[PDB]
Design a protein around this ligand. Structure first.
Ligand SMILES: [Cl-]
Ligand SMILES: [Cl-]
Ligand SMILES: [Mg+2]
Ligand SMILES: [Mg+2]
Ligand SMILES: [Mg+2]
Ligand SMILES: [Mg+2]
Lengths: 467, 467, 467, 467
């Protein structure tokens, strides 16, 4: 059941209703690539939920109370105060780049253990219930290997498990033993987990994981773009916390990490901003080192930062993002879409709190993988309903940088994400209806072939035509 | 069918989800009078659609571009420019009071005809397809009698008619003849018409009405709080204008009036503001007289007026309110609610574009009229779903100012209005479900009796208890 | 000395710098009437300070947190809470019309005393240290005579007195005795007083006045558009309150009135809004009656009111308007301009906190009164520096409504008002320099004569030419 | 002469006026380091003008019209349209990091010439009339040597020259010849130039420089954080363009570069944002490569970017920043402060459009360099007037990373920068008065010594005490 909005809509962004003929011409002009479509020509944009959601009245208002001072800004103080009251963390570093300055804390933590415990850079390995792509990227760029210790139930769509994002506790222990505690720079706890489309991590699991890390004195970083949704799943599925507020669950949750890194463009409800925070004085040196590197990250002083209004807005968003009614509504809407698609026969390889990954291959079996069935489905969805989605298959995969040959892809998927507090149940039904129509006219959908192909990141600007 | 929102929600006002126990206590504290409830304790507030709807991004942004100059404000110029381009009217007077300064143009028009055609104040009569309550009030206060010349099909819920708000052309002609053209100060064309819950007026009807008025040289005022919805109904139901844009229909529509008066708090999408405009130089003296009276209305100079941002916002709202996709969506939502209620057996005495008037008497037959069955229904709807609606029955009617006895009331109705772009299909279904539940437990609902009753306007602050 | 701004400018409204030739053409097109000039063509607009000043960041932000509910709005609650904490008054009625609903409380108070003490409408007289024009207007319109009991020092520009706005305590007592206590519907305490361009009222004077009123049980209404500036003058000039905060002085000040009426467009820093408040339960019936009349003021129900954001903004403005640094700065700027003009030989008939009234007659002696020397000066000031000011002389006075002859005027004055936090010391020096230039080329300035003259309120739209 | 503001102040940020005793305690708590002071305790913050200035009404309003789409955003289109109309550049890349993605175009240009003309990375040298510190940093980090070819008059405070920021045309030619054209990856034209506190570059000089670069086919990048002020100086000092508008001068100016890089936090009037743009198709490959690197700059995909409102705001700011009246006013204010300081005997090593560098050594000769006389002056300025400025001397210089010994410093300077449209002439006079007081009590000011010193970037968080 789709819950009624626990809010009154106050400000809207008009979106024109286009004709089928118009969209047919539009998709052709864009070279059968939704990425090349004008935003105005997209009725329901499911490209991403990162920074594309709505804000509350108080959040928007906060943008006009900014203190733009270079240092000592009351807006920075307000944000740090929210972090202290919400997460219990004493040190806050606002971030305006990718994620939560992962490019910052990673090299800082590696060097810390190298100087204190003789960490060996050639043998170092970092662990996580599941590393986000960028987190894994910065780790590897820094010469650190990563391992995801997720549980057996994680990717098993056949079995139902309350916390599929949980750490494989024995796997983690085994990994540390195997690698050597001196060689483990940090452990990243991602909540909710990005495995299987987004799955929650239980507080019991986080506590157990933290005890293991503490035993070996390994820094624990909470990757928390979706800290609120994880708190909601705990309140909903972990009996012990059934009567706890989202705020209490969050305060308790963060006792089991030493610091946190997060993009504020998800649960925090803002279009820009991030955070890198440290719990207490035990990590004061890590805070100092990170703040310092933030300035000379380029190898010399460089200044930048969120405008005052943005810090005031995030200071409010951290609270509004934890609203119980809101969280129940947001999650119920995502589940409503997934359940609706399943009902009409649409199959997803994985579907969770973050996104649904429709199997375009099964939906359009007559199309060869090399002809990008998921990109064709994306185009068809646009033609039929003006929906824009992202292909996660051979098209995205690209070619071998050394052979120029198409890389092999396990499955041709079409990703559906939902911007927060942006679309309604009617839009969800509109999407479901669109897939029902596509499924019905599947055999008639054509494969694609390049008319223009960039050497790198081809999915963003490549142009194709029907076969 | 409820259409999908032709927009992306951008700003929301959080509303808490309350428990039944909480609402039970709340309604008691408010003395079984929703008017006394805190807005925060109301989940779906259907009290009124006047100034309670959402605004577009451009409209909200306009509030920050205000020119606060006492005279010659570029913001005033922008608003007048919108009126000139949209309605074709050369003279604009922004209003910030009730409706569109009806308290202004009425005395001005009466005096005009009195001086030019020897109008007799003791015999004067004003006509309209249907006078809004306030319009009728200012007319009568000024000593002018009013007559509503609506068509036979107007209040006949048994027959379907495309334009139930139409003028009874022969009735108007007959009335003028009867009263004497010199004694008819003005004719007010209300669009959409407030008869039968809101019904459209055809352009063919307006043209015919204007020819009659022109023949007798009688000023025609377009009461247009809902000018856009009327334009939409014309595009939808009047074949001649099927392919015309809302803008073209509006420009054409206003050729058939000499001036316009409107509250901008409906179709114009703003929380405050109104307009009093004159088409061309033929009414320049009426414009001058109105502007003058605006200043010395109290019998001496008094200054006030919309802030610059409000005029800039309205200048934009007049355009956004005419968006075709928006209008189709808004109207479809209203019809969706009505159709849904009819389906579950809920009966309305009248239902149209403005509101739905549920018959509380038929829904709760065991409750005596004197015990206010519509007020009881209002309370029950709040208890069950946190919905706030307004009683239009014996409670509102009140007592005889000369006898202190309850006045006789034709029907006990509960009014449902829908704030623009504020609630979703899910809320509409929530409302329908609430009525379904009430209908099922009807026999158990109790009547009400006063515990506190004001001498005047008792419906706003009276307190009652169950019998 | 002009104090430095106790604030950082955050948002500006661009104003173009025009050439002398451009302004010469502009003033001609406007018929030698600044009222007819476009705001954009005015560099320094000294027309009025009513709703033309700047707002603080928090005030502007508040506009986006509005609760538009018809009743029970949290925004209304926030405003009432500010009034309760600032003035100590328990009942609040937001106003959106002229001043503070003087058209409301006056008839309510007259009727109250008529029913309770047999007040005689044919003999009733209201008192005030000095009635504002509109206040006097509503009193007289209601058939009530008014008397200003100001002190001897009030209009004496030759003597310096700390509180020229003080009530003539013995005069008030004598007046009540003379008129009869049953016939005195109310006493209005205006702070700061509008006499002599704006003069403060001491707390000692207000206390003494209230004791007199209390003795005769006569309602006291505090007309407080400039309550903050009065509080500042008390802190500056009344020794007893030297170390009290503006907030403490204000709380104490309002113990000496039973209710308050104020336009929020002055000290409260907003472009729109007003207030009508009652101190405690002793005036609950007056509150109820006023709220009721607010609805049926037209003789029937009419709905209107400030939008939610406006109430939230005023809730903040009442506090920001009391900022000590701000008040000292605002007042010092006004005094800076006056002192500067005096230094160059410019003479004012009166000058105070509200405005400076330059004597155009003395500055331009060669121009006959009937040729409007103050209107000529206004035009010259615009030609020379792009300054717009308002004439308060024969031009404004107009003709005898019964003789059509020019009415006799005591002096030809040009009013200078200063919008709050809008202009700088540089603008003040620019204004002073402009007058210095005018004084130097005075003999060459020409008188004016009509080319177009309205029958009423001619000063607003009349057009003239040079003689 | 300080010009009057060509604008009306509309929104203000309150700043409290502190007592001397309060500031004395505050500066001690901050360890005699203004960087550690709360913004609220700073009356006049001259720390930096980067993103600390005011915005216009239209700019602020634009923040509410954002299109947050990941791709095809109408807000991105609006910004690109402004760039095309203002600079004539067809390709736009919005930046949200440091400056204008210098970390992006530098490696792209180096690789371009390496592949096309066999550039030798071990011999490459980049030229500029004067490289900004960050620009020089990214160049060197990329292994590229830099040379500043400024003119002899540049740093000569004894001689007056209209365009001290000019390229040393013969020096540039000689340098390219010396280095070898194949080894010169790019030439950066900084406008206005950061040499000698900010000095303009003439259009004649830019044209001559571009002809030289074009002759050798060397890419020219316009570093234009202050493009508007440079245009203003050209209109003021370069006779040929005396009657040209700032817009025309800017369009002409950019014909002499192939691309532009700029922080929008200066002349563009925004608190955040930057730009990296390419003129035409000749640089389409450079645009494509830069956009690509923008995504995989970390060595893998990372997503981030300005929120829609920020792009809409910058789209407006580029225009408002070119307002002629505004530019004349801004520059006149800076010159007013400098002239005022010179008048009272304060000496600056250099002073220009960007900042004034007061010689603390000469002002406080009794203080040893190692005791940081400029940091002492900064503290004294705060104690006396609540002014916060930045030390540019031994304190900032720091210690030798290899010896731990204090590094030798040429002069002990105190930098004064002025946030745009933030402070008034009164604040400028307040600053001048403060220096007059310091100069008078100079002998009594004490030197400083560390109580806490970080290993790196000590100037930001170090704490000291008086000697
Ligand atoms: Cl706020
Ligand atoms: Cl806008
Ligand atoms: Mg900043
Ligand atoms: Mg106004
Ligand atoms: Mg309202
Ligand atoms: Mg974004």
């Amino acid at each position: 059941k789709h819950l009624p909005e626990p809010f009154r809509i106050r400000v809207i962004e008009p979106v024109k209703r286009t004709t089928r003929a118009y969209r047919e011409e539009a998709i052709i002009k864009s070279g059968m690539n939704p990425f090349l479509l004008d935003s105005e020509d997209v009725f329901i944009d499911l490209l991403t939920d990162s920074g594309t959601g709505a804000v509350t009245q108080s959040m928007q208002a906060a943008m006009m109370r900014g203190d733009e001072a270079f240092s000592g800004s009351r807006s920075y103080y307000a944000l740090a105060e929210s972090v202290k009251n919400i997460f219990g963390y004493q040190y806050t570093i606002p971030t305006h780049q990718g994620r939560g300055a992962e490019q910052i804390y990673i090299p800082v933590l590696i060097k810390k253990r190298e100087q204190e415990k003789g960490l060996d850079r050639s043998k170092m390995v970092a662990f996580s219930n599941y590393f986000f792509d960028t987190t894994q990227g910065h780790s590897q760029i820094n010469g650190c290997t990563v391992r995801n210790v997720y549980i057996k139930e994680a990717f098993d769509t056949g079995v139902r498990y309350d916390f599929k994002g949980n750490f494989d506790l024995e796997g983690l222990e085994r990994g540390i033993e195997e690698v050597g505690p001196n060689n483990v720079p940090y452990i990243v706890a991602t909540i909710t987990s990005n495995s299987a489309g987004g799955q929650p991590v239980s507080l019991a699991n986080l506590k157990a994981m933290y005890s293991i890390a503490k035993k070996y004195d390994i820094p624990v970083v909470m990757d928390s773009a979706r800290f609120a949704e994880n708190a909601y799943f705990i309140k909903q599925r972990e009996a012990e916390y059934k009567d706890w507020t989202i705020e209490q669950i969050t305060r308790e949750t963060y006792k089991y990490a030493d610091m946190l890194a997060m993009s504020a463009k998800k649960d925090a409800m803002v279009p820009m901003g991030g955070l890198l925070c440290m719990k207490d004085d035990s990590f004061f040196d890590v805070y100092t080192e990170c703040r310092t590197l933030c300035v000379v990250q380029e190898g010399f002083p460089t200044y930048g930062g969120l405008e005052g209004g943005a810090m005031e807005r995030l200071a409010v968003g951290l609270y509004d993002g934890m609203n119980l009614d809101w969280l129940a509504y947001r999650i119920a809407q995502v589940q409503y879409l997934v359940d609706g698609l399943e009902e009409i026969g649409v199959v997803c390889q994985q579907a969770g709190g973050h996104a649904a990954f429709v199997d375009a291959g099964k939906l359009l079996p007559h199309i060869p993988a090399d002809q990008f069935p998921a990109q064709a489905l994306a185009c068809e969805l646009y033609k039929v309903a003006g929906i824009r989605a992202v292909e996660i298959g051979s098209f995205l995969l690209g070619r071998d940088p050394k052979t120029g040959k198409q890389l092999p892809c396990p499955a041709e998927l079409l990703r559906l994400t939902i911007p927060r507090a942006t679309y309604t149940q009617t839009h969800m039904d509109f999407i479901i209806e669109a897939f029902k129509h596509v499924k019905e006219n599947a055999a008639n959908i054509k494969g694609l072939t390049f008319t223009y192909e960039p050497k790198v990141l081809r999915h963003f600007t490549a142009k194709l035509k029907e076969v």
